[PDB]
Design a protein around this ligand. Structure first.
Ligand SMILES: Cc1cn([C@H]2C[C@H](O)[C@@H](COP(=O)(O)O)O2)c(=O)[nH]c1=O
Length: 558
């Protein structure tokens, strides 16, 4: 009679229940149901639940207490015509859907795998309207990832305990992420500030208005003294010069709004704008999503659907006006993270705490803004001559706010070419170059994406998973490398070159995408991975005098 619909959480079940008819019975598996534990050695194989020596055979086990949950599903399955798997659209979502279908058993024809990137009336309709099949390639991709991660962790770690210290850990990508922080740490420790000066000038227009200028050239060459004397020398020359407006240029400029958020950009914005960490932002994001307020929070696509863009353009038109609505929609190049209904304001959210509302507001503003016209400004650039010196002044005036209208609310004098300015005061100032900035959780993710290391679905885990391991720590919202973090990084770099290499790591991601798109077979990809890995691991175990990993020692004076 009725149909069975399975989701992974209660909150997701309630929201989706609002859009599924009487013939549907929604049920949340409430968790993962089944998963993995916690030249071959049976001991290692059981702890991992994967066998690199018997063609990657796995040993999945239902989770604790989840046994009664299993039987409850089987019952609902026998009294339902069709079974719908409505797990989240990403790969682990596909895998979770796979585990459900394995555990419940039955004919494959009995199953369907729905896909949706937001939980709305219209989205849930098209989802169950044209349902698809479980994509085994996306499943194979997800498991391959879990398998190699497991292999690196359970096989490299034992070596680290023997060579460095008990309790240490290793991570396929985790170690690579730690390397970036370790290199940044070392950069900062070795940086040597450099002295360089600047000179500003206070002048008067003929009328008598105040005009501030900064020295840019001397002898037509850039002006950049490096000590106190070089400056005073230039200062006393400038004190006698006759100042005049050698040139004026007025050009209209514009500023365009940013593209709609994606996982990485969202985290950075949340961290920069609201001081939210990656974990905080991703938990609220998911909470808003499962509540039906925003689209799926794991994406690297900045695209927007036709309806989404048409609903927003209408909003801009009713609430802002003709001059804010571009002629044609803005096209940036799955969907971006955006509100599900542009007409629902942050203040109208129900089950959400203050910060989850602030995040929604941020997402809302970005979305609305990206579809509005750009801001217009009238820039002015005055160039002033004085002896062999050339000075400059910058000024900007807003003419049309455009997109900045949806963001919170927030001047050179009049002079013609050839006018004489009167010197009033000369102000020298000493500065010094700064060392590279420290990574933030979000910035680190940003760096990872730039290098193609993470994936919208692993960033948060990567970030969290490299902490409380004694390698890197967050202090004042910034990353700091610990000594043990450098100790382990050099070891891995010397004895696991390929695994620590940035290009090889990014390549693995491409590698994994290829399995998902049927451009590669998962076991073959795992075999090649294991081959390179065990060759590295074998040499690492040898005594250092044969090229093996160095011990964390320090011999006497003997
Ligand atoms: C669930 C999950 C998905 N993903 C991804 C990467 C892909 O961009 C995305 C879906 O891609 P696909 O449509 O090509 O299969 O799922 C991860 O990287 N890690 C995860 O844990």
């Amino acid at each position: 009679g009725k149909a069975l619909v399975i989701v992974e959480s209660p909150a997701k079940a309630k929201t989706i229940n609002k859009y599924l008819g009487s013939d549907y019975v929604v049920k949340s598996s409430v968790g993962h149901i089944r998963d993995l534990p916690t030249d071959e050695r049976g001991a290692l194989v059981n702890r991992m639940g994967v066998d690199p020596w018997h063609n990657w055979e796995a040993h999945y086990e239902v989770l604790p207490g989840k046994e009664k949950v299993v039987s409850e599903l089987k019952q609902l399955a026998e009294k339902a015509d069709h079974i719908y798997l409505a797990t989240d659209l990403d790969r682990e979502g596909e895998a979770i859907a796979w585990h459900l279908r394995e555990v419940i058993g039955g004919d494959d024809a009995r199953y369907s795998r729905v896909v949706f990137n937001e939980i709305t009336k219209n989205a849930i309709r098209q989802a169950f309207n044209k349902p698809g099949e479980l994509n085994i390639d996306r499943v194979n991709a997800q498991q391959a990832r879990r398998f190699m991660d497991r292999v690196v962790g359970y096989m490299v770690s034992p070596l680290l305990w023997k060579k460095i210290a008990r309790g240490l850990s290793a991570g396929r990508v985790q170690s690579v992420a730690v390397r970036l922080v370790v290199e940044r740490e070392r950069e900062i420790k070795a940086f040597v500030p450099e002295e360089f000066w600047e000179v500003d000038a206070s002048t008067t227009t003929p009328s008598g208005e105040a005009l501030a200028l900064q020295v840019t050239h001397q002898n037509d060459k850039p002006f950049r003294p490096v000590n106190k004397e070089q400056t005073q020398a230039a200062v006393s020359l400038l004190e006698k010069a006759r100042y005049s407006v050698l040139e004026r240029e007025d050009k209209p400029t514009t500023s365009k709004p940013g593209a709609p958020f994606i996982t990485s950009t969202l985290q950075q914005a949340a961290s920069t704008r609201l001081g939210f960490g990656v974990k905080k932002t991703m938990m609220m994001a998911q909470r808003l999503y499962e509540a039906g307020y925003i689209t799926y929070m794991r994406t690297d696509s900045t695209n927007l659907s036709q309806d989404a863009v048409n609903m927003v353009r209408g909003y801009i038109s009713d609430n802002f006006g003709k001059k804010y609505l571009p002629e044609s929609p803005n096209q940036y190049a799955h969907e971006a993270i955006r509100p599900s209904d542009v007409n629902v304001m942050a203040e109208s959210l129900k089950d959400m705490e203050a910060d989850a509302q602030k995040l929604y507001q941020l997402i809302w503003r970005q979305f609305v803004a990206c579809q509005m016209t750009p801001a217009k400004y009238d820039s002015t650039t005055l160039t002033v001559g004085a002896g062999d010196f050339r000075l400059k002044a910058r000024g900007r005036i807003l003419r049309f706010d455009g997109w900045t209208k949806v963001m919170p609310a927030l001047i050179l004098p009049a002079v013609n070419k050839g006018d004489a300015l009167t010197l009033v005061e000369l102000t020298p100032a000493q500065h010094f170059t700064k060392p590279p900035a420290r990574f933030s959780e979000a910035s680190l993710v940003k760096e990872l994406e730039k290098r193609g290391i993470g994936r919208p679905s692993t960033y948060a885990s990567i970030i969290s998973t490299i902490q409380d391991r004694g390698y890197v720590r967050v202090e004042n919202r910034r990353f700091y490398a610990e000594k043990m973090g450098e100790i382990v990084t050099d070891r891995l770099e010397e004895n696991f070159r390929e695994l620590m290499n940035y290009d090889f790591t990014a390549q693995m991601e491409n590698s994994l995408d290829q399995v998902a798109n049927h451009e590669a077979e998962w076991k073959a990809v795992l075999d090649h991975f294991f081959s390179d890995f065990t060759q590295q691991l074998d040499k690492a175990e040898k005594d250092p005098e044969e090229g093996g990993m160095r011990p964390n020692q320090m011999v006497l004076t003997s």
